[PDB]
Subunit: 114 residues, 3 copies
């Protein structure tokens, strides 16, 4: 699985250990092994949400399966929760796009997972 966060929040407000925490939580939440979890955080971004430049995030989670109605609802609670608690971002200023990737459309290590 792959999680990317884009946010106008400053670099200095991203706590040390945020990436490891995202890794550990996403592992538990998706049921996938941490070695396969990647996380990416892009602060200091020039963005707006609903015309306002108060703290916000635009994120995405890609996975081969482990993506669906119930699962996505659950991930939103978890991840908005973490963006709220660690980055002080209100959950009504967060979008997260989910992508159920086909195994043939994910490369890793000189091949694909198909």
């Amino acid at each position: 699985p792959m999680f990317i966060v884009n946010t106008n929040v400053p670099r200095a407000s991203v706590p040390d250990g945020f990436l490891s925490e995202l890794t550990q939580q996403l592992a538990q939440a998706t049921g996938k092994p941490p070695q396969y979890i990647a996380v990416h955080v892009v602060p200091d971004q020039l963005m707006a949400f609903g015309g306002s430049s108060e703290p916000c995030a635009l994120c995405s989670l890609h996975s081969i399966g482990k993506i669906g109605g119930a699962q996505n609802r659950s991930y939103s609670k978890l991840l908005c929760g973490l963006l709220a608690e660690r980055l002080r971002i209100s959950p009504d200023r967060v979008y997260i796009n989910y992508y159920d990737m086909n195994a043939a459309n994910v490369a890793w290590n000189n091949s694909t997972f198909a």
Copy 2:
């Protein structure tokens, strides 16, 4: 809806009001209210288009519906137009990918649609 622009154009060439303009115009164009429009502009990027490093942009627009043949044609005119007029980027150096998101695959506010 969500619009992201990535460009090699410098931050200082992005005019004051560009994000608000994109917000207003996307609202009108998609028919969705401005509060639900997000915009993201990433300047100073290391990128090339056709091997040339003259000004260019790689962009994406994500929306739950309001995405299709004619609508996408219309958005290209609008958005290439704005990148041309405000960022001085030639429209033959712009790509925009459109994504019709399923409501279940977009989180907002502790849940999904």
Copy 3:
């Protein structure tokens, strides 16, 4: 075609001809002309792969056709190869997501390819 690389490798370690190289190689590999190829490299990123912050990359290749099982398998070899040699990134720390774009969903030059 479009190729984006996101990496924790510093900007100074990205060689100056990397974008042209990616362009030329993707042209040969996809069978499209170099003028249709765009490439984007985002260094200095705050990321982790499998809990570790050693060099890694999250990438994506978008194209209208020229995307599929065998082709993707081949592109992974090529691109991991380039990331290994030029950016000194181990291939087991690379993901590439492939996207077979419908022509109606790609804009260029005031219109779409539909």
